[PDB]
Amino acid sequence: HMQFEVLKRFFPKESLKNCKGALWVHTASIGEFNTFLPILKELKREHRILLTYFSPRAREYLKTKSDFYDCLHPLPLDNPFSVKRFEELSKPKALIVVEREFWPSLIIFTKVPKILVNAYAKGSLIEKILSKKFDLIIMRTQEDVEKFKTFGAKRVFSCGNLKFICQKGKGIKLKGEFIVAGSIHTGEVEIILKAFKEIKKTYSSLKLILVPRHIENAKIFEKKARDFGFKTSFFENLEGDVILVDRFGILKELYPVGKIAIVGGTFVNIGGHNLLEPTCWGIPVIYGPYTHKVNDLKEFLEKEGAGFEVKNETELVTKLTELLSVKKEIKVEEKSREIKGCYLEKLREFLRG
Amino acid sequence: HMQFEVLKRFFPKESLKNCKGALWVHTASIGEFNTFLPILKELKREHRILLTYFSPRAREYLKTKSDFYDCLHPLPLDNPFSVKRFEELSKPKALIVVEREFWPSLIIFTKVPKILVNAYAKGSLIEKILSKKFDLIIMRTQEDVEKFKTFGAKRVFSCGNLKFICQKGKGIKLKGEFIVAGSIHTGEVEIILKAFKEIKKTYSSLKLILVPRHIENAKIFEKKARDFGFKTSFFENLEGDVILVDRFGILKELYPVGKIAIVGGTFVNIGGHNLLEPTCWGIPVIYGPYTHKVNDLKEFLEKEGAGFEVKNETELVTKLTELLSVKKEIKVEEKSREIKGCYLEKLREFLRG
Ligand SMILES: Nc1ccn([C@@H]2O[C@H](COP(=O)(O)O)[C@@H](O)[C@H]2O)c(=O)n1
Ligand SMILES: Nc1ccn([C@@H]2O[C@H](COP(=O)(O)O)[C@@H](O)[C@H]2O)c(=O)n1
Numbered sequence: 104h105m106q107f108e109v110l111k112r113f114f115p116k117e118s119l120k121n122c123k124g125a126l127w128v129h130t131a132s133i134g135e136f137n138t139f140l141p142i143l144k145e146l147k148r149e150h151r152i153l154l155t156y157f158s159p160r161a162r163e164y165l166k167t168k169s170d171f172y173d174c175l176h177p178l179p180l181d182n183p184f185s186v187k188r189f190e191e192l193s194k195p196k197a198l199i200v201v202e203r204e205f206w207p208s209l210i211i212f213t214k215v216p217k218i219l220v221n222a223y224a225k226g227s228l229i230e231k232i233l234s235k236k237f238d239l240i241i242m243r244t245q246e247d248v249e250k251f252k253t254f255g256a257k258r259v260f261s262c263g264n265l266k267f268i269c270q271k272g273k274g275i276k277l278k279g280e281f282i283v284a285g286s287i288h289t290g291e292v293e294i295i296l297k298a299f300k301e302i303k304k305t306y307s308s309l310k311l312i313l314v315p316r317h318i319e320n321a322k323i324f325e326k327k328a329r330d331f332g333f334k335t336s337f338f339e340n341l342e343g344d345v346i347l348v349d350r351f352g353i354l355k356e357l358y359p360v361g362k363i364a365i366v367g368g369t370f371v372n373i374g375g376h377n378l379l380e381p382t383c384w385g386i387p388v389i390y391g392p393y394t395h396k397v398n399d400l401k402e403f404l405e406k407e408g409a410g411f412e413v414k415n416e417t418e419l420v421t422k423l424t425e426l427l428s429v430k431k432e433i434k435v436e437e438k439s440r441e442i443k444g445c446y447l448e449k450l451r452e453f454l455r456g
Numbered sequence: 457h458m459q460f461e462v463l464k465r466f467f468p469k470e471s472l473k474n475c476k477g478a479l480w481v482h483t484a485s486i487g488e489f490n491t492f493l494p495i496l497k498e499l500k501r502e503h504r505i506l507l508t509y510f511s512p513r514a515r516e517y518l519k520t521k522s523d524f525y526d527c528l529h530p531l532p533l534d535n536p537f538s539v540k541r542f543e544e545l546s547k548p549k550a551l552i553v554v555e556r557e558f559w560p561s562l563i564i565f566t567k568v569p570k571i572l573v574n575a576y577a578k579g580s581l582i583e584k585i586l587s588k589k590f591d592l593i594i595m596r597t598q599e600d601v602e603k604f605k606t607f608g609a610k611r612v613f614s615c616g617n618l619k620f621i622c623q624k625g626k627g628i629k630l631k632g633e634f635i636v637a638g639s640i641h642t643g644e645v646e647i648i649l650k651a652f653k654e655i656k657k658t659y660s661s662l663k664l665i666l667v668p669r670h671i672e673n674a675k676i677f678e679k680k681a682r683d684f685g686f687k688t689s690f691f692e693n694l695e696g697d698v699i700l701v702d703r704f705g706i707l708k709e710l711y712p713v714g715k716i717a718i719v720g721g722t723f724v725n726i727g728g729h730n731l732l733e734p735t736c737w738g739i740p741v742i743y744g745p746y747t748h749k750v751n752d753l754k755e756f757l758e759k760e761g762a763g764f765e766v767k768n769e770t771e772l773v774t775k776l777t778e779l780l781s782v783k784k785e786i787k788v789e790e791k792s793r794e795i796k797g798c799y800l801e802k803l804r805e806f807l808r809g
Contacts, residue, residue: 180561290673
């Protein structure tokens, strides 16, 4: 059912001709495109964009994103003739590779100036070989920068991690005093209601906004909150002690309403959901121990004093009271504007000539 | 953190030389490996095995499967030199490509006799070009065989879909009368308990074994069952009317214990979990209407009279009643032996000379 686009990877479309002189951006898949999007948004204002991708999963997604590019084509197969026909048709001014995508024939056989963004060093031979073929490399940490320097890469800088850029959107305002728990799993729901109950003994006017990972469980979450003794309501309606959200697509807009956020996927062995969203609004986030799928992000937030790992119900209780009595300052957003700015300026300067 | 093995894909390992004359099996990733495992098991006994894979995700998994191969190497990069260095070093006797993996430099530049297994026709140009470069093609349906015939492929047969091969394991035994509900999600538990309750009015000895998609939900599932008025217990202990399973890894062993299986991910919009497993015990399986991720399997089971879709609680009751009152003969297992035998013999035939 998926389009693999083999013929096109092997023998790129004659129609790339119409995209001559574009800025070439390569985003392996959906993750890379989303990581890069706050940069593409700005470059799109100053360049025609030729957008390529490697994963066949990304084609459909990327079709919905035609506002952010002029041409769309799968990465050419990694053979000198396929890579060279692509280049020869499209006459690109530069190629920005998001994250890594060490394709040897791509890198070795194209003449186009090449830029690497958001890279980390792994210390492997292939890095020793390909790193130097980039005209500009922008890395996540100064540590990674040192390693590539010892590879004889000229023009390697550090701008921080692109994945820490805030994409806040509009934000919702509600009268009241709220904790927001987002992306909560069935196995997590008990610990959070037992803690909130413990909390409410002290903060009587405090309302919990409970947003399940899967909205098909809202009714079961509500009933659970009844059995624990809470007044409950479904969002719009703020009358409950526990307000349930049964609509997808609202959670990130909803965070700014809380003094504290809790992000699920974390008290059960899921590996964690998006810890960044609440902190972008200057609000601290608590999560359980299972953050192995968002590790870089978890470590980032701890360094920033914005993220707090709790092991159980007692610790969650403890941590909530601490944060309710002393308002924690969070400067994630400003770090975000700094990461964005660092990337944009290096890229604009490089592309200037 | 994953190894992409770029350098090896570009310049395959000298030590492939110690694998001279092996049967080369290519499994893109985990899915393909598992699909082919029942043929590999048998071919392993007559041949040295050189196993390649494309996804970096597959490496770790396949390292645990060293019983099934002699050499393990990532698929060479798709350039004539990388493909040929691989071939030259390893001197394979044949290459069996599982499923599709239409890699053109792979297909065009190697001399090794090539076999394609479990293929289907998509009717596309790359298929017209590459399909004839295979010395033997074994497809899912006679329809697919047809299409490739008109592409001038010689040696094209239909053996069925390898994904319908049963891999049953041991099979647990319990005193009692059971329905087994497997990989049930939170948003599905209510309709299953409601239907089972309506069923228990007539069949008072029936016990329901409830196996959540996720372990951590067992306690919430148990409480839910109590709210419905059932005695409950946790597995080992068969005393409840509803018996929870809070350990992973036994669902597939448990199925034969029941007269009917219900498989979840199908009543909520998940797209379905493994419908095949119970039918391999000769036991009919019921599922809800969301089977879009498991659609070929769904259609197969319907054709076989082994799988029944139900829209809601009322239909689940009706269908459970039908199957409880009149025992349904299921011949999936027998079909499975036929698919496995058709593939195995064609392959052994072609490999003999
Ligand atoms: N019930 C839910 C659950 C998640 N979400 C959102 O969907 C996205 C989920 O992404 P993550 O997997 O990165 O956590 C986030 O934007 C989160 O805010 C939502 O809007 N409603
Ligand atoms: N509680 C659970 C849930 C699933 N399982 C198993 O894990 C595998 C899940 O695969 P599927 O996604 O295809 O359903 C199946 O073999 C199923 O038997 C289990 O053993 N215990």
